[PDB]
Design a binder for this molecule. Structure first.
Ligand code: SF4
Lengths: 1138, 261, 261, 261
DNA sequence: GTGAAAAATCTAAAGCATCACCTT
DNA sequence: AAGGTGATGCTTTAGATTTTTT
């Protein structure tokens, strides 16, 4: 990019920010500010030298706003050999004359350095430039030349590692001088001769109300085709400033005039809209643009507008004598987004994508609106909305303003506080926490915390190629074996149903000698209350003995169970807190031997196991050396079309890796019948307990911060209830502001906490340690299998889902007990007993006695202590447990179940097909009906009978072929709604049903149907062209809305029946495949679990798999299986030699 | 050292291809009298027994009794390589972990000396004493093979009845039932194709039909078989192998228990 | 009651091999003139006619008109485990819901019985009028079967084109199209190898090729085949038997409507 | 143009049965000397050379050299239509992408035609050096095929040692191991089952068995197979296609470089 | 949005039973 | 003239891929 273009861009952005009312402070003075925006911008200094800076955009309480251009030189670090630090600086200071701002030495600790606690700091060479463009110039000059040197391993050759090179520059300013978003600042502008001064004002915390512009559109479209960007015109546009709403219509495509009207779904959201009507597009676009000019917003709000609304509006404006660049400031960038030079662009779909913890079944407007806001917006179909508006456009107006109000209030209630609480700790401007994934924001947070510890930061790791584990065996995938998820049984477990319980008296004898210990530990560690203040200890410690003895003498019973979700709220944060495991500390024996802290009988080692999984090629070292030496000097097609022939030795690593994988995908396809062999082995890791605590303490700090903020949220909620009972407006408003601030802070902290695990193993993450995830998930599996074996002793486990066990226990088991304590803080303390015994068993086997801490850094004082925060919270007695069973031999469904709360409401669905994507609508309303109808009944057979009286309805529908049920709702009853991931030419030779229907639409409509990503492929399978696979029968639903003779011609050329005379949907659809689909669903959910619980078959309309029925008839046969050993006498025992 | 050489070797091929199907693991046993097999199946439902006598072999040289638990599907797969008229020599050392098989081709030109390793396992050892068998019939092998392929398309439980009118093979199943009645021979001149009966009392028993399919893989081994049954005793299927020896398939019935009466 | 003694079993057995894939379940017709079947295809395209006359068999004994809804696949399984030279006795009852099969051997010592249940089935009956067909062509069974089962490698539908000079078995598809030409023979003595072309007018027709592959399953049952057609009528395929039975295939043509004009 | 007739159809189609699976792309080059195929699969370890001389064909006439870039898997689905003795006829034009196959019956009555299309391609033609062969063997196709499909069940990698006394085929794996020894025969009368080995120095190599399984699909084509090997030279499998042609498989051995020492 | 696991397809290969040929 | 034997279609099942839930 030419520097003249950069200067023109900088002066144009300065003028544009001036006309949006962010005037720059030029005079000396004090000001108060609240940062809402950071941008990187070139600002010319007093020396008339090209130089970057960051524009902060502050707003104030009264609505006045301004900007501050702070210059800070971009910089990074380079690593040199010991004794070769000053010479590198000497060389570097005579080879970029007029380019380097300065160079210096900033010593920092390392994370992977041996003998790191003796007192050494590997001093780095800090290099600082003037502008970001020169920074990119120098990195492209220097980084690959020595990066390849480091990968394969003149004074320039002695630099070993360019560190911290992928960081954004403005994020480095946000880390360095400690200016985060959404804090109050005191800014002193003392003139041009000195840089502007910024300080943090933490006394004031009340959040001001910014200026926000939400907007949504409607678009005219020709039928069956989504609207285009060169013939269509904006149908109308609606928008929102701070709750107030304005709509701008267009007369030539509306049918009558509409006046001002309001639309409120609930008293929380007020929807006052003022409507303006203009004859053509010119007045529409000019009025919208000038209203943006007069209002001067600071943050935009869209709803899936980054790929649909902004490109179409820009393309429509640029042809009508205008420009989005010179009018509003919106354009594409290097990442295919729309980033304003003076405004923050908020895409409310990204928050649903990342932070809402929702599946991908709820990203559209209606489901994401009803999932978080709490109301159902008006449904409108895009195909007939134009024709509907031509008759009367008031419902069109309702839909557009519903889009606007939904996206705006979805922002201001949930996305706005959560995002503005995320950026108080993450050094990102708001347009970065929303867009980037959970990995990058946690990376920046640890960036901050590790800059606070003065340690240099690891680079984003290089992707490993041609993986070599033991002997050849090039791995397609290298993985750690995750949480052991198992459903041990299947069927119903209801609270009042009787269940046969076998019980081991030895386990009850074991608990005889430990009730004293369990109820000692239940108060000495979980409530921090010593026993010297409670006096009811003998009452509980003979009541439990009496109850457990009453259970002991009859260890085989039939009575009602209690269902418990014995789990940990956040086990993955809790283990990484407890064991002091660090992704910068897991080391092998050689580096520990290099340490001078390897004293005899040391405690700085901690051992742990984990399970490693590999899917690898059957080929050996020779069979891969042959194909890599063979591919030496042969031509390949270039990536650029119409290019010259290019050879192997200058290929990029990605394309050559893909070609090697493709070659070995068919070399061994005809030599060993398989492409990868699944291998699971054991590995052992040794972990230092004295490495930088920048991670475990950070997790701990956020854990106790979440606890504290939850306590403040509770007391502020009680204050808010008292305040709304009072009715004084100012104190209610202040309390509500503080309440939402603290709630968003705690929700942001827990969203950080849950994703500390998920960041470590990510490709391109600075702290990439496979061992972290491996050993933490192995420990989380070992603790839960200890829990599962103890429960299998004293009851019945039902589910293990790598967070906790689900359990049915006898009803006379000791469940929970109270305690009268004389302490003023805790006059009464209640605690559950199964949780307590789980705590004591995990502090009999998981005590980190080597949990190490620092006391005196100067004298190297190290203190060992014991603490286990691993607690099995109980969720009380639920009402019902549902597990499904599989058709396949032996195995059954995992990670999917359905639990109910006490009052009959649905507590939690999980992993089921009711709310999946890519599933038919017949197998979802079915599941939702049968689960809510399931809980009825008296005994075990009554439940299955009652649920068969509702699951047989959806067989009566399909056998009758929907005669009385109107065909109007038939069309969406079957239609598939799967979504694509790539383009059709990206798939290449791969074939499936979605690719087939996309290619059918490719030869039915234009090629532009399938060019855009995320296409919603819709298809059903017909009946007449039998014999073929179901690939060629995937006809679209799109044809049924087209012109009739077009349907006839395409149907003739597609399903190949020229003699056909009837074209009804009721006969073209083969009902046998749909009956098969619903039957596989009903035998996943009901039939097989019913058979597995010795119950007569509830629904006889579907048949079992052959392994089930045969065994059933055998067990109900007059003859009984008689073996040979019990039948007839024995001889003895023997063994066989070598 | 244990070396056993036999001239016509299709017999040892077929007898052990009939051993692969029924059981997964067997207990090879060697002694002066002959080769013994007394290993049960993995389901602990049916039993196989082999006594391959030494006097039939062309050459036999054995040291003492020794038991080794060689798997059977592996020996059957490697033994399929041999031709239908090969000369078979089993060789085992005194304390080695590998046994060898020598196949000598009918052309007197091709030699094929293979070997396989051993593995250890834990299997019950059982001994069958002598009980009077009330009903014994002599069945041609191909006729019994058509019987087992004929009843098994009906169900999985077989009635093996022996009455004055003869022998009855029945089976019930989801598509109905099947009844096959056979009478003894009176005026036939040949023995390998005839059927003979002998009885003490009428016998009314039922057995597992799948395991009969597992049994009857030794049909072309020899054209005759002994079917023996009595009250509450395991069914005896005695397939004799030439002058070599014999095999007993022991099929434990699933005896009716008094529950509803 | 109903008794049906049939000496040569193949003329029943192979027939089931020609039906189990084409019609999964059908209604049977019997009479004193033999057995008549009008079976309708599963996918509702084709029809199959079987007329096995009474004196072509060995013995029948019937009282009145009976219709048995015997499912094809299970009775095909029952006959799958029989003998070729086996003599078969079919037994049926007026009111009972079972059908009996008796297998007996020329050696007199191999007799078996089977019982198969029946279920009620509703199949409509169509009366095809008798029309003078323009094209009647005679080919041997083997060449017609091979040409169908090897031209189905080309495409998915066939076009037959008959004139004075011969018939044209063309078929088009993704890999290309293939046409098959037949000449005339005058120096042949044995009637199976003899190919002749009978003309009334040149005829153009198009037919389902997959159905031609499914049609050529009764080719071991016969030795010669006659294909007949006329103007806009379904193809009729006849596998004439030696005065024991008679076979008809009705393949409704997929006529080309004028949609491009 | 190009019109070709060959009375012996089998000698063509079985040839292409050897090429249905191993290679899926064909680049025919035709000249006055005959027709030539030089293909090499995407595995980059297997080469096929197929030459049919002009004089072997019954009638041969060609105008100029042509390049025929047509996939080879397609017509293996197409040349199984013709019978055994059925005469093969090839029709090709100067620059038409359409090839015509005609199957002329030996009774001059049953003819046919199919048409095939070619694609575009860019395939490098690798030269074949003429080097001396250390060990050669002329040995029956049936016995080699039996050796291959018998050792394909034991292991997957084969050790072939062509010594002076004969040849050893060793197969090792998890199922066990086994080696088979063949020697040269001297007192043999007929040459369709005789063996003969020539020696310069003993060659022992390690090969692949699935490639050998794909090679020996054409065992009914010829009764003699010429295997030639040397030190780090690919196996040459030569089939003498009647008298006209030779099919040559070139297989690069899996030479294990020293890494463990 | 880790990893484990599910649903739903092609798909390619092993094993098997059945039929054509051939020799004893 | 019939049973061994090989070719070959039929049948079942592991598995390669995608989307999605967790
Ligand atoms: S655990 Fe001890 S020996 Fe190992 S790296 Fe840490 S301080 Fe050094």
């Amino acid at each position: 990019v030419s520097a003249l273009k950069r200067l023109e861009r900088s002066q144009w952005t300065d003028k544009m920010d001036l006309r949006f009312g962010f005037e720059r402070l030029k005079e000396p003075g004090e000001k108060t500010g609240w940062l809402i925006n950071m941008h990187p911008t070139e600002i010319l200094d007093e020396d008339k030298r090209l130089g970057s800076a960051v524009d902060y955009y502050f707003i104030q309480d009264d609505g006045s706003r301004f900007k501050v251009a702070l210059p800070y030189k971009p910089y990074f670090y380079i690593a040199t050999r010991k004794g070769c630090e000053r010479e590198v600086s000497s060389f570097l200071s005579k080879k970029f004359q007029g380019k380097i701002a300065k160079v210096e030495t900033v010593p920092k600790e390392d994370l992977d350095l041996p003998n790191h606690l003796v007192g050494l700091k590997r001093n780095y060479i800090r290099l600082s430039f003037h502008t970001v463009e020169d920074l990119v110039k120098v990195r492209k000059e220097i980084s690959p030349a020595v990066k390849k040197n480091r990968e394969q391993d003149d004074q320039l050759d002695n630099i070993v590692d360019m560190r911290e090179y992928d960081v954004p520059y403005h994020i480095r300013l946000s880390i360095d001088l400690k200016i985060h978003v959404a804090h109050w600042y005191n800014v002193r502008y003392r003139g041009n001769a000195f840089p502007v001064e910024i300080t943090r004002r933490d006394d004031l915390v009340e959040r001001p109300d910014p200026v926000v512009l939400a907007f949504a559109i409607a678009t005219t479209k020709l039928p069956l085709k989504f609207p285009d960007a060169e013939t269509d015109q904006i149908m109308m546009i609606s928008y929102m400033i701070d709750g107030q709403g304005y709509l701008i219509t267009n007369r030539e495509i509306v049918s009558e005039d509409i006046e001002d009207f309001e639309f409120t779904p609930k008293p929380e959201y007020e929807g006052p809209f003022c409507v303006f009507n203009e004859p053509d597009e010119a007045h529409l676009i000019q009025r919208w643009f000038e209203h943006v000019q007069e209002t001067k917003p600071t943050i935009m709000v869209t709803y899936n507008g980054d790929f649909f609304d902004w490109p179409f509006v820009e393309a429509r404006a640029a042809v009508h004598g205008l420009s989005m660049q010179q009018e509003i400031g919106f354009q594409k960038d290097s990442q295919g987004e729309y980033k304003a030079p003076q405004c923050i662009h908020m895409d409310c779909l990204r928050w649903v994508k990342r932070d809402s913890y929702l599946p991908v079944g709820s990203h559209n407007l209606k489901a994401a609106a009803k999932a978080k806001l709490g109301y159902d917006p008006v449904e409108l179909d895009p195909e007939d909305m134009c024709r509907m508006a031509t008759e009367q456009p008031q419902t069109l107006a309702t839909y557009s303003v519903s889009d606007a109000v939904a996206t705006y209030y979805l922002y201001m209630k949930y996305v706005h506080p959560f995002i503005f609480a995320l950026c108080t700790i993450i050094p990102m401007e708001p347009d970065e926490v929303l867009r980037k994934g959970s990995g990058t924001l946690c990376e920046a947070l640890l960036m901050v915390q590790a800059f606070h510890a003065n340690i240099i930061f690891p680079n984003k790791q290089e992707q490993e190629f041609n993986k070599l584990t033991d002997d050849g065996h090039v791995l397609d995938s290298e993985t750690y074996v995750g949480g052991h998820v198992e459903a041990l049984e299947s069927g119903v477990f209801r609270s009042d149903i009787p269940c046969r319980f076998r019980m081991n008296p030895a386990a009850f004898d074991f608990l005889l000698q430990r009730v004293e210990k369990t109820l000692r530990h239940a108060l000495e560690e979980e409530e921090k209350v010593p026993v010297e203040q409670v006096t009811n200890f003998e009452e509980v410690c003979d009541e439990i003995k009496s109850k457990l003895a009453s259970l002991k003498d009859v260890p085989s019973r039939i009575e009602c169970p209690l269902i418990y979700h014995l789990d940990v709220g956040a086990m993955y944060p809790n283990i990484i807190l407890t064991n002091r495991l660090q992704p910068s500390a897991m080391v092998d024996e050689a580096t520990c031997a290099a340490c001078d802290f390897n004293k005899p009988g040391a405690n700085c080692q901690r051992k742990m196991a984990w399970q490693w999984r590999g899917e690898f090629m059957p080929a050996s070292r020779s069979e891969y050396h042959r194909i890599q030496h063979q591919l030496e000097s042969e031509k390949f097609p270039p990536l650029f079309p119409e290019g010259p022939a290019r050879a192997f030795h200058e290929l990029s690593r990605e394309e050559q890796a893909k070609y090697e994988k493709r070659r070995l995908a068919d070399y061994c396809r005809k030599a060993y019948k398989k492409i990868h062999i699944t291998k699971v082995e054991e590995r052992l890791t040794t972990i230092c307990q004295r490495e930088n605590s920048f991670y475990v303490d950070t997790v701990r700090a956020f854990r106790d911060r979440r606890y504290e903020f939850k306590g403040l949220h509770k007391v502020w909620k009680k204050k808010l209830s008292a305040a709304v009972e009072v009715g004084d407006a100012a104190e209610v408003k202040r309390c509500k502001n503080m309440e939402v601030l603290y709630d968003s802070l705690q929700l942001a902290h827990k969203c950080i906490l849950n994703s500390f695990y998920g960041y470590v193993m990510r490709k391109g993450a600075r702290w990439y340690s496979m061992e972290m995830a491996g050993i933490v998930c192995f420990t989380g599996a070992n603790i839960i299998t200890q829990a599962r074996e103890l429960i299998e002793q004293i009851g019945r486990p039902l589910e293990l889902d790598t967070d906790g066990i689900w359990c049915v226990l006898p009803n006379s088991f000791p469940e929970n007990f109270v305690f009268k304590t004389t302490n003023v803080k805790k006059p009464k303390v209640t605690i559950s007993y199964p949780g307590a015994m789980l705590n004591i068993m995990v502090k009999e086997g998981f005590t980190n006695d080597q949990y190490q801490e620092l006391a005196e850094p100067s004298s190297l004082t190290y203190v060992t202590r014991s603490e286990n925060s691993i607690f099995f919270e109980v969720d009380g007695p639920y009402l019902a447990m549902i597990l499904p069973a599989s058709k396949e031999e032996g195995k059954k469904l995992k990670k999917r179940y359905a639990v109910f709360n006490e009052d009959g409401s649905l507590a939690e669905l999980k992993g089921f097909e009711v709310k999946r994507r890519g599933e038919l609508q017949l197998i979802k309303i079915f599941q939702s009906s049968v689960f809510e109808a399931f809980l009825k009944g008296s005994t075990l057979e009554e439940v299955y009978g009652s649920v068969a009286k509702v699951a047989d309805y959806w067989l009566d529908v399909l056998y009758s072929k929907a005669a009385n049920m109107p065909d109007s709702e038939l069309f969406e009853l079957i239609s598939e709604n799967r979504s694509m991931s790539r383009k059709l030419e990206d798939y290449g030779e791969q074939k499936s049903t979605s690719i087939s229907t996309a290619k059918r639409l490719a030869e039915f409509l234009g090629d532009q149907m399938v060019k855009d990503a995320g296409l919603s492929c819709r298809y059903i399978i017909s009946r007449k062209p039998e014999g073929s696979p179901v690939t060629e029968r995937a006809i679209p639903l799109a044809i049924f809305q087209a012109e009739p003779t077009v349907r006839k011609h395409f149907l003739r050329k597609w399903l190949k029946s020229s003699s056909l005379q009837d074209f009804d949907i009721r006969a073209i659809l083969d009902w046998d495949y749909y009956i098969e689909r619903l039957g596989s669903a009903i035998q996943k959910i009901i039939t097989i679990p019913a058979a597995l619980q010795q119950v007569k078959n509830p629904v006889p309309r579907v048949k079992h798999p052959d392994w089930l029925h045969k065994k059933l008839l055998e067990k109900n046969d007059v003859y009984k299986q008689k073996k040979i050993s019990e039948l007839f006498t024995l001889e003895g025992r023997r063994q066989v030699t070598m | 050292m244990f070396e056993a050489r036999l001239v016509q070797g299709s017999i040892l091929k077929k007898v052990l291809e009939a051993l692969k199907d029924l059981i997964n693991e067997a207990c090879w046993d060697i002694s002066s009298s002959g080769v013994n097999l007394q290993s049960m199946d993995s389901s602990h439902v049916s039993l196989v027994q082999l006594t391959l006598r030494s006097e039939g072999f062309d050459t036999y040289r054995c040291d003492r009794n020794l038991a080794m638990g060689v798997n059977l599907t592996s020996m059957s797969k490697i033994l399929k390589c041999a031709g239908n008229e090969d000369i078979i020599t089993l060789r085992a050392e005194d304390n080695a972990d590998t046994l060898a098989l020598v196949f000598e081709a009918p052309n007197q030109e091709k030699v094929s000396d293979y070997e396989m390793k051993l593995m250890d396992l834990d299997v019950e050892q059982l001994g069958i004493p002598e009980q009077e068998y009330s009903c014994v019939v002599k069945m041609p092998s191909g006729e019994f093979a058509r019987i087992c392929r004929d009843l098994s398309h009906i169900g999985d439980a077989v009635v093996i009845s022996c009455a004055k009118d003869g022998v009855k093979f029945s089976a019930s199943g989801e598509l109905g039932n099947g009844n096959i009645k056979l009478s003894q021979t009176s005026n036939v001149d040949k023995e390998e194709e005839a059927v003979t009966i002998e009885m003490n009392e009428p016998v009314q028993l039922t057995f597992a039909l799948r395991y009969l399919n597992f049994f009857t893989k030794a049909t072309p081994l020899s054209s005759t078989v002994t079917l023996s049954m009595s009250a509450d005793v395991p069914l005896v299927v005695e397939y004799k192998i030439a002058d070599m020896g014999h095999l007993k398939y022991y099929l434990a019935p699933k005896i009716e228990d008094e529950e509803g009466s």
